[PDB]
Scaffold this active site. Structure first.
Site, PDB file in Angstrom:
ATOM      1  CB  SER A 155      -0.808  -0.183   1.009  1.00  0.00           C
ATOM      2  OG  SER A 155      -2.063   0.629   0.942  1.00  0.00           O
ATOM      3  CG  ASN A 187       3.886   7.614  -3.446  1.00  0.00           C
ATOM      4  OD1 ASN A 187       3.739   9.155  -3.618  1.00  0.00           O
ATOM      5  ND2 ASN A 187       2.854   6.966  -3.883  1.00  0.00           N
ATOM      6  N   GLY A 210       2.092  13.216  -4.382  1.00  0.00           N
ATOM      7  CA  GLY A 210       0.589  13.245  -4.618  1.00  0.00           C
ATOM      8  C   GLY A 210       0.212  12.123  -5.582  1.00  0.00           C
ATOM      9  CD  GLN A 242      -0.467  -9.714  -1.921  1.00  0.00           C
ATOM     10  OE1 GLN A 242       0.298 -10.229  -2.997  1.00  0.00           O
ATOM     11  NE2 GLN A 242      -1.007 -10.618  -1.327  1.00  0.00           N
TER      12      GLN A 242
HETATM   13  N1  LIG Z   1       1.447  10.866  -2.752  1.00  0.00           N
HETATM   14  C1  LIG Z   1       0.031  10.367  -2.621  1.00  0.00           C
HETATM   15  N2  LIG Z   1      -0.764  11.301  -1.876  1.00  0.00           N
HETATM   16  C2  LIG Z   1      -1.729  11.269  -1.644  1.00  0.00           C
HETATM   17  N3  LIG Z   1      -2.537  10.079  -2.259  1.00  0.00           N
HETATM   18  C3  LIG Z   1      -2.007   9.244  -2.783  1.00  0.00           C
HETATM   19  C4  LIG Z   1      -0.480   9.179  -3.039  1.00  0.00           C
HETATM   20  N4  LIG Z   1      -0.003   8.195  -3.753  1.00  0.00           N
HETATM   21  C5  LIG Z   1      -0.889   7.427  -3.633  1.00  0.00           C
HETATM   22  N5  LIG Z   1      -2.310   8.006  -3.206  1.00  0.00           N
HETATM   23  C6  LIG Z   1      -3.687   7.193  -3.205  1.00  0.00           C
HETATM   24  O1  LIG Z   1      -3.616   5.957  -2.275  1.00  0.00           O
HETATM   25  C7  LIG Z   1      -4.203   4.778  -2.875  1.00  0.00           C
HETATM   26  C8  LIG Z   1      -3.324   3.847  -3.460  1.00  0.00           C
HETATM   27  O2  LIG Z   1      -3.548   2.371  -3.481  1.00  0.00           O
HETATM   28  P1  LIG Z   1      -2.236   1.362  -2.983  1.00  0.00           P
HETATM   29  O3  LIG Z   1      -1.185   2.196  -2.697  1.00  0.00           O
HETATM   30  O4  LIG Z   1      -2.760   0.301  -1.905  1.00  0.00           O
HETATM   31  O5  LIG Z   1      -1.749   0.711  -4.280  1.00  0.00           O
HETATM   32  P2  LIG Z   1      -0.370  -0.183  -4.423  1.00  0.00           P
HETATM   33  O6  LIG Z   1       0.388   0.112  -3.436  1.00  0.00           O
HETATM   34  O7  LIG Z   1      -0.354  -0.144  -5.890  1.00  0.00           O
HETATM   35  O8  LIG Z   1      -1.470  -1.362  -3.980  1.00  0.00           O
HETATM   36  P3  LIG Z   1      -0.896  -3.090  -3.234  1.00  0.00           P
HETATM   37  O9  LIG Z   1      -0.748  -2.716  -1.883  1.00  0.00           O
HETATM   38  O10 LIG Z   1      -1.926  -3.589  -3.609  1.00  0.00           O
HETATM   39  O11 LIG Z   1       0.607  -3.054  -3.638  1.00  0.00           O
HETATM   40  C9  LIG Z   1      -5.005   5.810  -4.036  1.00  0.00           C
HETATM   41  O12 LIG Z   1      -6.311   5.912  -3.303  1.00  0.00           O
HETATM   42  C10 LIG Z   1      -4.090   6.928  -4.288  1.00  0.00           C
HETATM   43  O13 LIG Z   1      -4.719   8.029  -4.863  1.00  0.00           O
END
Ligand SMILES: Nc1ncnc2c1ncn2[C@@H]1O[C@H](COP(=O)(O)OP(=O)(O)OP(=O)(O)O)[C@@H](O)[C@H]1O
Length: 294
Positions: free
Chosen positions: A13, A246, A282, A165
């Site tokens: 995440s 990030n 972002g 994950q």
């Molecule tokens: N820099 C940021 N600032 C604000 N919100 C963010 C930022 N980066 C990502 N997001 C938000 O966080 C959520 C991302 O989903 P997630 O990070 O679980 O994806 P992932 O890492 O690809 O997933 P996983 O855990 O399955 O690997 C989204 O709603 C996105 O808009």
């Protein structure tokens, strides 16, 4: 060596979807591939503001030179979910893009389905995509043979592979049994996508300054402070070539700049040359910056 593999270096995440979309826009892969099990979705938002919330399809489908989308043998997916995601991007999945579902991918009616596939009972023809494809025409257009899968990889020019994950949730890392049902490492992702090891070009590892989810000894407070030990362990096993950090937009400059240094000191401590190359401020394409610029 033409596969870029995106992985998550913590508990997940981390916004791996954002860098996957970003890389797909910047590099224009013709083939995008994954092997995900049911999840809460991966999100990418482009420059013009369009949002993709994907639990099955890779976020890399935004590549401008997309030709193939490939769902690997380790995939566990709902057919309803997949058809919804395909339809919401039908403008991208036109007549010029081939979607291939590995014949041994698992269809959900997650862990119970993964067990039934491992059971290998010859008269249960409801489990693997090859067998479901005989009575469910929604995926019949998509599932290929093992030979077709291998030919698609052979025919690809540059491949974006998106991992699942995060490292610390691995089946065989320290937190068992409070972990997922698979190892979350480059070796296992490539195995579950059927990608031969010599195709790997680089691993892009992702992290956030305050990782989400016991835990590592040097982190507290679910949201935790940054863990140097967790990053050391992830670097040793995952050996990323590049790192995307990030949610820097949640910290002061001094804050996330110190973590850049810590990530690179952990890398070096575990014989890894990784560079923090991307920073995220972002959820949008327009918020991903180059570390050498900030
Ligand atoms: N820099 C940021 N600032 C604000 N919100 C963010 C930022 N980066 C990502 N997001 C938000 O966080 C959520 C991302 O989903 P997630 O990070 O679980 O994806 P992932 O890492 O690809 O997933 P996983 O855990 O399955 O690997 C989204 O709603 C996105 O808009």
């Amino acid at each position: 060596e033409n596969v870029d593999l995106v992985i998550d270096l913590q508990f997940g995440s981390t916004g791996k979807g954002l860098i996957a979309g970003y890389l797909a826009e910047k590099n224009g892969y013709d083939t995008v591939i994954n092997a995900n099990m049911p999840n809460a979705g991966h999100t990418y938002i482009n420059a013009e503001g369009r949002k993709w919330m994907h639990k099955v399809l890779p976020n890399g489908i935004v590549s401008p030179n997309l030709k193939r989308v490939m769902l690997g043998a380790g995939s566990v997916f709902s057919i309803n979910r997949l058809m919804e995601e395909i339809e919401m991007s039908k403008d991208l999945l036109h007549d010029k893009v081939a979607i291939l579902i590995h014949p041994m991918a698992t269809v959900l009616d997650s862990m119970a389905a993964m067990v039934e596939k491992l059971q290998r009972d010859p008269t249960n023809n409801t489990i693997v995509a090859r067998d479901v494809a005989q009575y469910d025409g929604r995926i019949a257009q998509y599932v290929c043979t093992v030979e077709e899968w291998d030919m698609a990889l052979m025919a690809s020019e540059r491949i974006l592979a998106e991992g699942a994950q995060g490292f610390s949730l691995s089946l065989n890392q320290e937190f068992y049994p409070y972990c997922t049902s698979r190892d979350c490492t480059p070796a296992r992702f490539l195995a579950d996508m059927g990608i031969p090891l010599p195709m790997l070009n680089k691993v892009i590892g992702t992290a956030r300054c305050h990782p989400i989810r016991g835990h590592y000894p040097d982190q507290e407070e679910r949201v935790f402070s940054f863990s140097f030990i967790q990053m050391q362990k992830a670097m040793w096993t995952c050996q990323p070539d590049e790192v995307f950090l990030n949610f820097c937009n949640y910290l002061s400059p001094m804050g996330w700049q110190d973590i850049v240094h810590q990530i690179e000191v952990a890398a070096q401590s575990r014989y890894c040359d990784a560079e923090v190359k991307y920073l995220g401020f972002g959820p949008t394409f327009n918020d991903v910056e180059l570390r050498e610029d900030v």
